[PDB]
Amino acid sequence: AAMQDRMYQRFLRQHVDPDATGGNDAYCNLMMQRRKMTSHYCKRFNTFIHEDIWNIRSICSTSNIQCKNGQMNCHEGVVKVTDCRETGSSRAPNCRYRAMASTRRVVIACEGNPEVPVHFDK
């Protein structure tokens, strides 16, 4: 579980920022860069979750549902987010985004002991 921890750390990096509440375009531009999703190509869509890690991890403890890829280790919850969508023009590593802040249903996959988030499904 050096593995499960690496996967969890990747989830935190790509998807977790507790104390923003809901960013604008500049927030997406900064965070996509700082969380390492722009150096080699521009990731087209990404979500940052604005909840405490304890609360995100709690989603793992809910009833299992199917992931998009067919796995059965997914879980749904409702959280504050900023969704970041690439503008379509941009050229890595200078990637540009449009932000949408909202509270919405998310689906995450969890693994391990304790169960932790390892993938953001939708």
Side-chain angles (χ1 to χ4, degrees):
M3 181 182 91
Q4 281 167 344
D5 186 57
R6 266 192 70 89
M7 293 187 289
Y8 175 54
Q9 292 302 326
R10 177 175 180 272
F11 181 94
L12 294 176
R13 175 177 54 83
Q14 292 192 166
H15 304 296
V16 180
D17 185 15
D19 294 340
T21 54
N24 69 4
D25 297 352
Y27 174 83
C28 284
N29 292 340
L30 177 69
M31 294 303 290
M32 292 298 286
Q33 174 191 88
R34 299 308 173 88
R35 299 301 189 81
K36 316 295 186 56
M37 287 171 282
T38 66
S39 190
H40 310 306
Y41 64 93
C42 302
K43 184 174 181 181
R44 286 209 209 230
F45 183 81
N46 190 63
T47 304
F48 295 103
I49 302 165
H50 308 310
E51 299 289 344
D52 294 338
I53 291 167
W54 184 93
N55 285 325
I56 303 173
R57 287 167 65 122
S58 291
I59 296 168
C60 300
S61 289
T62 64
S63 299
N64 288 236
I65 66 171
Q66 194 200 293
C67 308
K68 186 158 45 171
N69 74 351
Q71 293 175 211
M72 284 293 323
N73 64 329
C74 278
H75 304 273
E76 62 181 333
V78 173
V79 293
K80 293 191 303 302
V81 304
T82 306
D83 288 315
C84 301
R85 294 172 171 85
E86 193 271 324
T87 58
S89 35
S90 51
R91 324 285 287 212
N94 315 296
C95 301
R96 299 277 286 191
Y97 294 85
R98 300 299 258 255
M100 211 297 271
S102 75
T103 296
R104 68 175 182 83
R105 175 176 179 271
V106 303
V107 180
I108 62 174
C110 304
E111 291 188 29
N113 287 276
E115 295 194 282
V116 294
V118 296
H119 166 70
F120 187 90
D121 206 45
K122 80 160 130 178

